[PDB]
């Protein structure tokens, strides 16, 4: 099964 | 004067979010990074699908091309920056040292230099050809959002959640400016004009700033957009009005009027936050692109 949170990018995420 | 962009062509391929567009120095292309660890380049008039730059280990953040249009060069979660031959797809070298991700990068105007920033808080100078870091700044106190040389390749300006943006002396590393208005929400966005008296500054409270470098005073406030969550790209567009182009979180491209600080356009079409927006060197031709429920860039053509 693929991870349940591909890893993507830091701008595409929301930092808090 | 209002501009009339009209949508030309929507680019689909990233198989994720794109993260960034930029269009060649020599206007011939549009390069895109992506989470989907790719870079993808794109003709920039005619929207066709050119070829694929792969390499890094995961998704990458921004990108950056040289001034001769030949390299690329990349910002990445592997902690890692690249720099890449376009026509080779070869990674030239491969910039180690940032402890955190990678998430901002240009090159100077020379382009004998690349600064990057980084969630590891730092803003790092390095030697294109030798792929060496020349100066590690302790630049901020939070992940640094955005890096720029203004025109001259003299100044580095940065910004970061911290709240503040600094100017930092190339040659020696050392800070020369830090500016703050009357209050400090996170920063997620800044950039020299290109005359480089200016500095454009994006909040995360809904709010671009223009700022004149000298006088240390902000002069100009831009607002109607949805900014408090991402570091959406902003641009000054030059090559016909003057105006002042970003993304949004309400999926729109804003266009504003820069003297008079009116919204004069807002294009429609995405499906997911506009994180990146770029203009081209000579045409009045606008880059958009999307996060992960879209996927895709848009260019964007007006008359004026």
Redesign the interface.
């Known amino acids: 099964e693929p991870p349940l949170n ?7 995420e ?2 808090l | 004067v209002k501009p009339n962009y009209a949508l030309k062509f929507t680019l689909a391929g990233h198989t994720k979010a794109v993260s960034s567009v930029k269009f060649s120095p020599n206007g011939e292309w549009l390069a895109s990074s992506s989470a989907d660890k790719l870079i993808k380049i794109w003709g920039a008039y005619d929207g066709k699908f050119e070829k694929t730059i792969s390499g890094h280990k995961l998704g990458i953040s921004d990108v950056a091309w040289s001034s001769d249009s030949n390299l690329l060069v990349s910002a990445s979660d592997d902690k890692t920056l690249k720099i890449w031959d376009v026509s080779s797809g070869k990674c030239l070298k491969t910039l180690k040292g940032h402890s955190n991700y990678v998430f901002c990068c240009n090159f100077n105007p020379q382009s004998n230099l690349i600064v990057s920033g980084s969630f590891d808080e730092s803003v790092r100078i390095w030697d294109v050809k030798t792929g060496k870091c020349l100066k590690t700044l302790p630049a901020h106190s939070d992940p640094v959002s955005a890096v720029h040389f203004n025109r001259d390749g003299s100044l580095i300006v940065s910004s970061s959640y911290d709240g503040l943006c600094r100017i930092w002396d190339t040659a020696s590393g050392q800070c020369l400016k830090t500016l703050i208005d009357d209050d400090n929400p996170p920063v997620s966005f800044v950039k020299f004009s290109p005359n480089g008296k200016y500095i454009l500054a994006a909040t995360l409270d809904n709010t671009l700033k223009l700022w004149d470098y000298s006088k240390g005073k902000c002069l100009k406030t831009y607002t109607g957009h949805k900014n408090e969550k991402y570091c959406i790209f902003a641009n000054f567009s030059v090559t016909g009005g003057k105006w002042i182009v970003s993304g949004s979180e309400d999926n729109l491209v804003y266009i504003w009027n820069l003297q008079t600080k009116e919204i004069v356009q807002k294009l429609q079409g995405h499906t997911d936050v506009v994180i990146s927006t770029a203009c081209h060197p000579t045409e009045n031709i606008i880059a958009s692109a999307a996060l992960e429920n879209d996927k895709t860039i848009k260019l964007w053509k007006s008359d004026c």
């Open positions: 591909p890893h993507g990018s830091a701008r595409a929301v930092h």
